[PDB]
């Protein structure tokens, strides 16, 4: 039974109430607005469901809402009126996106939002109504007024926002009673002027966090309570905690200008003397046993601590009043040392050491599986992009999802990652058709993902330059063509899918990325299926940093054999976790194998060179991550052994030899 706790039962209603009463200075961070929406009573007031909460979350994330509410809010704090990344802008964008489609173009320098078009859009209206109510109270609560006019605003706010229920009725009555009591005292003392809201805010906070509960001190089980002042009860066993230095007794400095602190008298009551009297009272209140503990060793760096003067005096008196039965008459000081060593026991640092099981089975297991008849092409593509990830995320339907992150704190001043990768891809796809870039620039400036003005202009001017530098050698070998359907059969397995940009010369792609063995294998798979479905012709793919993958035309029998090998590998790999690293194994095979002799020079010097390159690929520099560092590989193994290293090398060689065979 734990007594003397603080009165706090319905915590989130009070926390939301005080946060909402901290209104007229808030900057309206979207994280705080979602924190407001998280309350179930507030959600049920405006008929918003937990299913719709996820839609609201991803919509607010994708829209781009970071700052305060309106133009008055952004101009009140003396900032330039950017006219963007505000709640009004986001809601206007979302409503216009409900009205039309996004590809048709901008209307008022606002790009409409594609997602919300169905029967889900009532959340937009509910959110807008809530925002309007918040803005109304933001304008309302700013001004000062006398106490008799500050009286009803608490009840008005409560009935304005919170949906009533019998469960939270106690909390509502508590808030109303405390607010009425504070204003009743203020009016009964006959004040006349006005008050800012911060005084009432922090006074109500301290008054709500003041009440305690001292009900169950004698429930019947073991009692846990503070050292209660003015108390002395006999008991059989008494135990204490926290007797170190600087904590007991309490060290309270006076107010600094007290009068009685300079002229002491008889009836004084200091906390230090009160604690030092209560210690002796607790000592004499025992009847059978006693138990005193403190903290001797700091857990941080194995430094030293000390117990308090009370227990130091107690153990000194115990030592100086008694002696051991064994060494009866040797010396007083050695008797002191031996008794003090006898009465003190110590405990081990961790609570699992024996001084105070069966191992984990391996995760890899043989698994039954039956091969289906028809497989899509893109399923093979997503499998062979990363086979371990595929085995986790399509065979047994788990995904180690990095969960939905928090809203970024501001508008992006500079662009990296996918946020510029899709921009680069869109710009290259626009520039390969020799169309105007100014229209798409206006489209992105309407969408709201560019720096304000000149910085965005300079960013566009350098990105367009680099994409045009790539696009010149892209367009140097352009030929018109169309798409076609792909249908082939191998090993009694139907393969169907689509493939774009088929021309009499062959195939052609472009991507604003870096050259890689994964991209080589992607183009390899597409070229093999194209050549296996008839169609004499080579293939080409240019990338950034002057890379190139190019493969000669092949024969139908060899193409069918290679697709058969890949299909059988996929069939084996989705049931048994086939392990292939498409970067480290690729670098190892590039170092090990020479294409001119069509053989591997297998001396130990080149083996060590290939091992060094493989280890550098597995663990890269301190400026980029390594392929070996990834969540799937960490779940597979916690460390690397040469047995698995040899298995990886062998399997990667067997399944990636044709790539370096036909590469040129």
């Amino acid at each position: 039974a734990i007594s003397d706790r603080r009165a706090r039962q319905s915590h989130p209603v009070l926390e939301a109430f005080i946060s909402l009463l901290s209104l007229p200075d808030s900057r309206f961070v979207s994280e705080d607005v979602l924190a407001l929406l998280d309350v179930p009573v507030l959600a049920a007031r405006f008929d918003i469901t937990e299913e719709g909460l996820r839609y609201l979350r991803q919509w607010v994330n994708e829209s781009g809402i970071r700052w305060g509410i309106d133009d008055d809010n952004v101009r009140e704090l003396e900032l330039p009126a950017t006219g963007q990344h505000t709640w009004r802008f986001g809601l206007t964008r979302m409503l216009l996106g409900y009205a039309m489609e996004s590809a048709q173009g901008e209307w008022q320098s606002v790009l409409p939002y594609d997602e919300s078009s169905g029967l889900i859009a009532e959340l937009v209206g509910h959110l807008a109504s809530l925002l309007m109510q918040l803005n109304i109270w933001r304008r309302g609560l700013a001004q000062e007024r006398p106490l008799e006019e500050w009286l009803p605003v608490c009840r008005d706010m409560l009935n304005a926002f919170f949906l009533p229920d019998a469960e939270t009725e106690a909390a509502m009555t508590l808030i109303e009673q405390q607010w009425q009591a504070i204003i009743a005292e203020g009016l009964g003392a006959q004040y006349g002027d006005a008050v800012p809201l911060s005084l009432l805010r922090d006074e109500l906070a301290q008054r709500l966090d003041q009440e305690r509960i001292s009900q169950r001190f004698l429930a019947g089980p073991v009692n846990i309570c503070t050292l209660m002042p003015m108390r002395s009860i006999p008991f059989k066993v008494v135990c204490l905690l926290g007797m170190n230095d600087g904590v007991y007794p309490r060290q309270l400095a006076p107010l600094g200008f007290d009068l009685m602190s300079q002229k002491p008298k008889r009836g004084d009551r200091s906390r230090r003397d009160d604690d030092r009297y209560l210690f002796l009272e607790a000592l004499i209140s025992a009847q059978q046993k006693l138990y005193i503990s403190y903290i001797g060793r700091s857990i941080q760096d194995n430094s030293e601590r000390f117990p308090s003067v009370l227990v130091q005096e107690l153990i000194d008196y115990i030592g100086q009043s008694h002696y051991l039965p064994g060494d009866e008459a040797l010396n007083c000081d050695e008797s002191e040392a031996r008794v003090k060593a006898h009465l003190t026991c110590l405990h081990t640092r961790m609570p699992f050491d024996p001084q105070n099981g069966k191992a984990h089975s391996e995760f890899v297991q043989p698994l039954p599986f039956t091969l289906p008849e028809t497989v899509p092409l893109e399923t093979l593509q997503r499998f062979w992009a990363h086979p371990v990830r595929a085995f986790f995320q399509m065979r047994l339907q788990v995904n180690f999802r990095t969960e939905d992150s928090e809203i970024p704190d501001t508008e992006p001043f500079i662009l990296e990652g996918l946020s510029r990768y899709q921009i680069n891809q869109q710009l290259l796809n626009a520039l390969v058709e020799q169309d105007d870039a100014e229209r798409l620039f206006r489209r992105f400036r309407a969408a709201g993902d560019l720096p304000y003005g000149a910085f965005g202009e300079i960013f566009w001017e350098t990105q367009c330059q680099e994409m045009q530098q790539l696009a010149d050698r892209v367009i140097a070998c352009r030929q018109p063509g169309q798409s076609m359907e792909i249908d082939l059969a191998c090993n009694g397995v139907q393969i169907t899918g689509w493939l774009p940009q088929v021309q009499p010369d062959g195939l052609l792609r472009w991507r604003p990325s870096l050259l890689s063995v994964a991209q080589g294998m992607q183009l390899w798979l597409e070229h093999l299926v194209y050549c296996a479905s008839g169609g004499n012709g080579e293939s080409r793919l240019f990338l950034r940093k002057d890379g190139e993958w190019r493969f000669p035309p092949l024969a139908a029998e060899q193409a069918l054999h290679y697709l058969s090998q890949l299909i059988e590998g996929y069939r084996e790999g989705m049931s048994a976790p086939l392990l292939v690293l498409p970067e480290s194994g690729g670098a190892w095979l590039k170092t090990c194998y020479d294409a001119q002799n069509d053989a591997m020079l297998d001396d130990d010097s080149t083996l060590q060179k290939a091992r060094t390159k493989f280890l550098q690929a597995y663990e890269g520099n301190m400026m980029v991550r390594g392929e070996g560092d990834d969540i799937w590989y960490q779940r597979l193994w916690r460390q690397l052994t040469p047995e698995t290293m040899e298995a990886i090398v062998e399997q990667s060689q067997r399944f990636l030899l044709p790539l370096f065979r036909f590469n040129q």
Partner: protein, 584 residues
């Protein structure tokens, strides 16, 4: 640049405008100075205004708040009242003497007599400059105070070590380019005047330095190849100690050398990886004491976020299956495959997580989490695995941190966003560090210089104490005003003054490195030349710390350094050449 009278004449006025370009190419041009100056005051003003408006106060702010009141004339009654109540003052160690604090002390107790002040200081070793400690405050403070005292007795190490640290600094006077810090005469103790370290028959001298063969090789070459030499000597010492060849002895009593007390020190965190491979190749595991890595960076926090959030979402079957596949939970592919198809085995875990959510909503994180730690029989099962006890500590550390998080925060759902917020940026604060595990036995300990204060070490190793790193940003202290003058431009006259301080601090840290090693100390050296070529007849180590004091303030070469190394060798410098080989 070649259109100047100072250029073309040495390589006629020739125009009246020909002297104008010489004006505009002697002083550079930018906007950076104005932008930085306009930024610096306003950021400090704005953050102070916001702190005052919200009602908080900083530990870095209370000192400045006291200083203004003491500087103003309103608080003379305060200045009298504090000296009335506290008529004595002593200061611990005095190296982190901030100018804010020294102004207070000099204004209060330097005058107003019959109230004395004491000062205890250790004028060197100065290794809190990155925290904010300034040595120029002590430099100014030495002038006004009259009396000066010094203590000599070590009570700690060998007379050979005391003679080594006395002999190493007698080549040149004013070894730190400062007249304001004196010479270092230290006398050894008398109780322990017979500390001897004996190995393989004959004894062993105090300092053993390792000279690098070659002309122009980087210390990266040592860290790649010859960093294994120190590990080889360490392995030889341990194998000899366990076979009774090496000894550690005082007087006539002796003890064998354990595999624990030998330590090695480095400068930066990067070369810890460069020295770890040199030791794990020879098959000696090594414990790391500079582990400033936060606990939040490991796999366990990433798994813990999924495990805790699956309790928050006990119905969404896609994200519920994240936790059961973790390495903490410990299931298999056949274990998940038989549960995906079955409905009732899926239905079993629903109430188990529902009760967990109720326990969390009723009591707290610890009653919720320890129930899961106890129910599934996981702590015992991790112990049977290889090193599961190593991983198990982090769960309890994270669980402890969640309590101090949840006593401050009151929103139940916001603890998840607190955790995901703290995951991203890895702060290097106090409570977010790891704990140590083993104490029955200890490996070779590796620790940085800064975290090596006030501890006794029998055997040390200082391999890479010959390399340097020059500074670029011009920021120096005036030789008279002792203020933090700042030139945002690139004046080489100020650059040299800012570079001499970097030269002195490396010498001070070198002196920090030698207050260790009760019995024996050892170190390495390498004649690295800055230019990429080798054969030029000069070096650049005299631009670093040790090279300047070994070259007596002159630029030399390998030929001028070879006999200079060997000249002062007498009974205390056991020098050996570089050994490109493996002993075992």
């Amino acid at each position: 640049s070649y259109q100047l009278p100072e250029s073309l004449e040495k390589f006629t006025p020739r125009h009246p405008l020909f002297e104008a370009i010489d004006q505009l190419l002697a002083e550079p041009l930018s906007i950076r100075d104005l932008v930085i100056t306009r930024a610096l005051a306003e950021i400090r003003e704005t953050v102070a205004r916001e702190k005052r408006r919200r009602g908080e106060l900083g530990f870095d702010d209370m000192l400045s708040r006291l200083d203004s009141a003491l500087r103003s004339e309103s608080g003379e009654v305060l200045a009298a009242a504090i000296r009335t109540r506290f008529p004595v003052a002593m200061i611990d160690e005095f190296q982190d003497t901030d100018p804010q604090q020294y102004r207070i002390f000099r204004r209060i107790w330097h005058h107003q007599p019959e109230t004395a002040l004491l000062l205890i200081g250790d004028p060197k070793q100065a290794i809190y400059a990155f925290r904010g400690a300034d040595i120029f405050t002590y430099m100014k403070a030495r002038s006004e105070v009259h009396a000066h005292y010094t203590l000599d007795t070590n009570w700690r190490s060998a007379p050979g070590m005391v003679n080594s640290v006395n002999k190493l600094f007698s080549q040149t006077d004013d070894a730190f380019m400062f007249r304001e810090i004196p010479f270092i005469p230290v006398k050894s103790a008398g109780k322990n005047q017979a500390l001897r370290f004996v190995f393989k028959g004959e004894t062993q001298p105090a300092m053993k330095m390792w000279l690098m063969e070659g002309e122009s090789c980087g210390v990266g070459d040592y860290q790649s190849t010859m960093a294994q030499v120190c590990a080889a000597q360490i392995r030889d010492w341990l194998q000899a100690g366990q076979r009774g060849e090496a000894l550690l002895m005082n007087g006539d009593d002796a003890r064998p050398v354990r595999a624990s007390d030998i330590s090695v020190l480095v400068r930066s965190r990067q070369e810890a990886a460069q020295v770890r491979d040199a030791l794990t190749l020879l098959e000696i595991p090594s414990v790391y004491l500079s582990n400033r890595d936060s606990v939040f960076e490991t796999l366990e926090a990433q798994e813990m976020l999924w495990l805790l959030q699956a309790v928050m979402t006990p119905e969404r079957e896609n994200t519920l299956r994240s936790a059961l596949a973790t390495s903490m939970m410990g299931l298999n592919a056949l274990d998940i495959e038989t549960l995906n198809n079955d409905e009732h085995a899926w239905d079993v875990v629903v109430e188990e997580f529902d009760g967990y959510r109720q326990i969390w909503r009723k009591r707290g994180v610890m009653p919720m989490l320890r129930a899961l730690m106890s129910a599934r029989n996981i702590a015992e099962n991790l112990l049977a695995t290889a090193g599961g006890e190593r991983r198990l500590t982090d769960i309890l550390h994270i669980s402890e941190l969640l309590q101090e998080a949840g006593t401050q925060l009151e929103s139940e759902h916001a603890l998840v966003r607190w955790l995901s917020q703290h995951i991203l940026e890895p702060d290097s604060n106090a409570s977010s560090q790891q704990m140590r595990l083993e104490s029955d036995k200890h490996l070779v300990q590796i620790v940085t210089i800064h975290k090596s204060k006030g501890l006794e070490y029998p055997l040390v190793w200082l391999p890479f104490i010959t390399n340097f790193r020059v500074q670029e940003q011009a920021f120096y202290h005036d030789r008279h005003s002792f203020e933090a003058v700042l030139d945002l431009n690139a004046a080489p006259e100020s650059v040299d003054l800012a570079e001499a301080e970097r030269l002195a601090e490396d010498l001070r840290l070198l002196y920090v490195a030698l207050t260790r090693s009760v019995w024996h100390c050892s170190l390495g050296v390498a004649p690295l030349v800055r230019r990429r070529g080798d054969k030029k007849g000069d070096t650049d180590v005299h631009q670093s710390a040790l090279g300047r004091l070994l070259q007596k303030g002159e630029p030399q070469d390998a030929a001028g350094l070879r006999t200079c190394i060997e000249a002062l060798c007498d009974d205390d410098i056991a020098w050996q050449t570089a050994q490109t080989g493996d002993n075992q």
